[PDB]
């Protein structure tokens, strides 16, 4: 499909420690910089606020932010989690690599197959299932319709294999005009018109094996975070027009899961 | 034809070798007893065969606009996956690096 993230650059960069600024490099960097796209609007500000919303609901999110590039526009940065200390690296593999797909077939999978990758490779699958549930609800609520196989990764850190910290989380729905789907990979065979029972019963109980108390607690976390999400969006660097689109989609997705009833 | 050293955190782990017929082979080193190149390629087995370019190594290549930047910079065929991996192999995602044999 036409992906919003395909038309944006990912530039390697070093943090000049003595100043508070980044130097773009071709190789051997510790940060990624994502400047404006000429194809889709406000992707850096969109990514910066979305990654902050994820952090507010308790997902694992690395250092990220915005900086000014030469042309006065804003550029997003993320601190790489496969780079640590002095020239040390952590193993990191995306789910296309782990399931035998490639860049051309990275949408040719399902949430059920994503679960199976976690069960096969993660040290504590049941713990990562809780994380995947929160992540999938989050992506539905903020309009991230581009969670294909290369946007899930497993990290090896401290001799534990788990789902990596967040990367590339973006409200891609409001960024593009004729959005085709809600989920990049189908769940119960569905990529559009997902319902509360798809997520809370089929996904959370039948496929992830979560207990009803755990499900209920996570849903309550999302209910509780909506006022703070609304506030954070209002204070973001998105334009007023893009803030309104972000808030309107969030409200629609919240209403679809009966948050306000 | 073309072979390449595959290393993990700087330690040589094995050889990615291209065979005739578009097939590929990865072979671990006896001396290597560290973390696997990929979770799909445990040290338990020392040889791995592929009828196409192996998805683990294909997954290190750039995409989208950054692939077009790579093909703007280098005289390389659009589908020479192994050659592109050699070009970017000094620094890719994760702990693995790829260096061509001669
Ligand atoms: Na509009």
Numbering used by the authors:
A (entry chain A): 52 to 312
B (entry chain B): 1 to 34, 35A, 36 to 102
Please share text taken word for word from the publication where this structure appeared.
Here, we perform structural and biochemical characterization of the Legionella pneumophila effector Lpg2370, demonstrating that it is a Ser/Thr kinase. Together with two upstream genes, lpg2370 constitutes the tripartite HipBST TA. Notably, the toxin Lpg2370 (HipTLp) and the antitoxin Lpg2369 (HipSLp) correspond to the C-terminus and N-terminus of HipA from HipBA TA, respectively. Structural analysis reveals that HipSLp binding induces a loop-to-helix shift in the P-loop of HipTLp, leading to the blockage of ATP binding and inhibition of the kinase activity.
